[PDB]
Amino acid sequence: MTLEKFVDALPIPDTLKPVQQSKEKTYYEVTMEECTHQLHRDLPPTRLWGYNGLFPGPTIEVKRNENVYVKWMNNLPSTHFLPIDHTIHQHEEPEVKTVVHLHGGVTPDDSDGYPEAWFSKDFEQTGPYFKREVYHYPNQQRGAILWYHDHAMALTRLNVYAGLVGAYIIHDPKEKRLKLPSDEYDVPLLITDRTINEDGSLFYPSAPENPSPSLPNPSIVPAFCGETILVNGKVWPYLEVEPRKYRFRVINASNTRTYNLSLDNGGDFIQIGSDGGLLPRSVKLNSFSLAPAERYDIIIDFTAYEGESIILANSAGCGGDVNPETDANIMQFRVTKPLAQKDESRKPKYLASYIQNIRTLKLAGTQDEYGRPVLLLNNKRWHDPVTETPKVGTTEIWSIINPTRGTHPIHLHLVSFRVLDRRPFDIARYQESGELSYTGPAVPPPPSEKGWKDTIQAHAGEVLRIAATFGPYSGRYVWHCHILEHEDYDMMRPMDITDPH
Numbered sequence: 001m002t003l004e005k006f007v008d009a010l011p012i013p014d015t016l017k018p019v020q021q022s023k024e025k026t027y028y029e030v031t032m033e034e035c036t037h038q039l040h041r042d043l044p045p046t047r048l049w050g051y052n053g054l055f056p057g058p059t060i061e062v063k064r065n066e067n068v069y070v071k072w073m074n075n076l077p078s079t080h081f082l083p084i085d086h087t088i089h090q091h092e093e094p095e096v097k098t099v100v101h102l103h104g105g106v107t108p109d110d111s112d113g114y115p116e117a118w119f120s121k122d123f124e125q126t127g128p129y130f131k132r133e134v135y136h137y138p139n140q141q142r143g144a145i146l147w148y149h150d151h152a153m154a155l156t157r158l159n160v161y162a163g164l165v166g167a168y169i170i171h172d173p174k175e176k177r178l179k180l181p182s183d184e185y186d187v188p189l190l191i192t193d194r195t196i197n198e199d200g201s202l203f204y205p206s207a208p209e210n211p212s213p214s215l216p217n218p219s220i221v222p223a224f225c226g227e228t229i230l231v232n233g234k235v236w237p238y239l240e241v242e243p244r245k246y247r248f249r250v251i252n253a254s255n256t257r258t259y260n261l262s263l264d265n266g267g268d269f270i271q272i273g274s275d276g277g278l279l280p281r282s283v284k285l286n287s288f289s290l291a292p293a294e295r296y297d298i299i300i301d302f303t304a305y306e307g308e309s310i311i312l313a314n315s316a317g318c319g320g321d322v323n324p325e326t327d328a329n330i331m332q333f334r335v336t337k338p339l340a341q342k343d344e345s346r347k348p349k350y351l352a353s354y355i356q357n358i359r360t361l362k363l364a365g366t367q368d369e370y371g372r373p374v375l376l377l378n379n380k381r382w383h384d385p386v387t388e389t390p391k392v393g394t395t396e397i398w399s400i401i402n403p404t405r406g407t408h409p410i411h412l413h414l415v416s417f418r419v420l421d422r423r424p425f426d427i428a429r430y431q432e433s434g435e436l437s438y439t440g441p442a443v444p445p446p447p448s449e450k451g452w453k454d455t456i457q458a459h460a461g462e463v464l465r466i467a468a469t470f471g472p473y474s475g476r477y478v479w480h481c482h483i484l485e486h487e488d489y490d491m492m493r494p495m496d497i498t499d500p501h
């Protein structure tokens with residue numbers, strides 16, 4: 001028997017309060033705490049690692065150009081409760097390393113959360129790139145859905161699965177005149193798949209299928225597909241909504257899983273924004289794909305559906321087809337709250353208006369000495385000399401070629417980018433020869449991808465082209481696959497945005 005669906009109200013994480021706020025600076029403190037929270041009516045409390053002891057973390061709301069500082073502290077225990085594989089990466093390091101990355105942040109390099117800028121409990125020990133306790137987020141960027149999460153070297157999949165995710169919204173007051181649904185009718189949805197034991201403890205696997213005798217125990221796995229789906233820290237919740245327009249900030253905070261969402265009454269979503277902010281023009285959607293770290297700013301118009309119960313449904317597989325009783329379900333909207341006031345919100349169609357190098361990038365896997373797949377960007381390891389070195393201020397086109405069997409959601413820190421096109425190629429030939437020979441025309445982005453993206457699905461047997469301008473800041477960043485199981489082994493590379501000064 002699987003946990004009974006739709007019997008816990010969707011929590012709405014509280015908005016973090018500043019420690020200090022003047023007209024020209026905002027200081028926040030966030031402490032990583034081991035904590036316990038009940039993930040379903042019928043479970044005992046689950047041991048979790050959460051920002052301020054909460055899962056998800058507090059929702060952080062800033063205005064565009066708000067000068068924000070965050071002191072992210074580690075008060076976690078010194079050993080992990082999830083299985084650590086020592087083989088993937090005065091010389092014995094602490095087992096628990098944390099660093100916070102603001103995903104989608106236009107962030108100076110020393111506050112971006114470099115994987116090797118980790119710290120242990122109370123900053124007692126720190127990685128090689130550690131420089132500062134208090135991170136600076138000048139927020140000089142378009143309003144959008146951001147999120148924040150752990151990024152420590154070789155531990156990212158574990159620390160995130162343990163609960164260290166939160167939302168961060170940048171409000172651009174020049175967008176207020178669109179009258180998009182707001183306040184109580186603006187709601188974040190952080191989607192996390194989890195596998196939960198009978199006693200409420202989290203399960204994370206300590207070995208993959210691969211039965212080979214040489215396998216380190218524990219071993220990293222190439223993918224994690226959870227049995228149960230959570231939204232805002234509750235398993236298959238319901239939200240009571242009013243019969244009107246709502247805004248939802250949908251964030252995929254899962255380790256590996258891709259969702260493909262729809263509404264079981266047949267209703268439509270209106271996509272208004274992507275990772276990088278508002279789309280140039282809205283889009284009526286009946287379904288959409290959402291890979292790890294992707295965000296979809298959307299409206300749902302519950303006006304025509306008073307009294308109905310509507311399932312937010314999932315059709316994407318993860319390690320097999322979806323099971324209709326379990327991972328085919330996300331959550332349930334109940335249109336049964338009395339309209340508290342007239343629906344003065346709007347759903348405009350029109351929302352906004354917007355080549356020094358080419359770089360070719362290969363996504364491929366090799367095999368380690370134990371027979372495990374190691375996933376790699378351009379056949380380089382994390383610790384190899386940096387090769388992606390655009391000059392600050394310059395625009396490049398990245399051609400990302402994927403001959404592997406699966407989609408990889410590729411994310412670049414600091415920037416958002418334009419999607420140019422995707423084009424299919426003959427893997428067979430490309431494999432055998434190195435020859436990039438196409439099989440059909442180039443496909444331009446749908447409307448969903450006509451704005452700005454920071455995390456982008458590079459599909460099997462396609463070459464993906466995107467255009468990024470590498471600024472405004474310079475320095476040491478990263479880019480990587482955002483399936484955390486891939487990132488940690490070893491599909492992540494440093495990215496130097498070079499500065500003549």
Ligand SMILES: [Cl-]
Pocket residue numbers: 180181182183185344345
């Ligand atoms: Cl509103």
Ligand SMILES: [Cl-]
Pocket residue numbers: 258259260288289290316
């Ligand atoms: Cl999909």
Ligand SMILES: [Cu+2]
Pocket residue numbers: 101103149293482
């Ligand atoms: Cu991220």
Ligand SMILES: [Cu+2]
Pocket residue numbers: 101102103104411412413414
């Ligand atoms: Cu990021």
Ligand SMILES: [Cu+2]
Pocket residue numbers: 375407408409481482483486487491
């Ligand atoms: Cu990947």
Ligand SMILES: [Cu+2]
Pocket residue numbers: 101151411413478480
């Ligand atoms: Cu990253």
